[PDB]
Write a protein that binds this ligand. Sequence first.
Ligand SMILES: *SCCC(=O)N1CCc2c([nH]c3ccccc23)C1
Length: 121
Amino acid sequence: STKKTQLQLEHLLLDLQMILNGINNCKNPKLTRMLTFKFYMPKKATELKHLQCLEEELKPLEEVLNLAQFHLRPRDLISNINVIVLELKGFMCEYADETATIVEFLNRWITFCQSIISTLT
Ligand SMILES: *SCCC(=O)N1CCc2c([nH]c3ccccc23)C1
């Protein structure tokens, strides 16, 4: 049961890294524009239930990805992430006051994933 949970988080980790790596390969003027979009960050993210904070931001994530343009369709990878987040989290999300770019948003959730995987090894 703990192994199944770990596997899901690892798939989530790799999905998120995929988006970040895809974004990091955008051309600089396009990327500059993409970094103007605001993403909302959890006040605290240490537990699986805090993934609610990720779930709520998945639609804006999908939109920004759609607005940029690839071998992957945004609706497919976001759907995969959605399924995993929904099955993992199984509470109202508390948001931090300061917003973030798509990059720092992705970095934060990548770090969350890696932190939780580390408690399951
Ligand atoms: S900005 C040039 C790169 C690009 O086309 N992107 C927009 C669509 C996209 C990117 N990364 C991902 C991952 C998954 C789905 C779509 C996607 C960056």
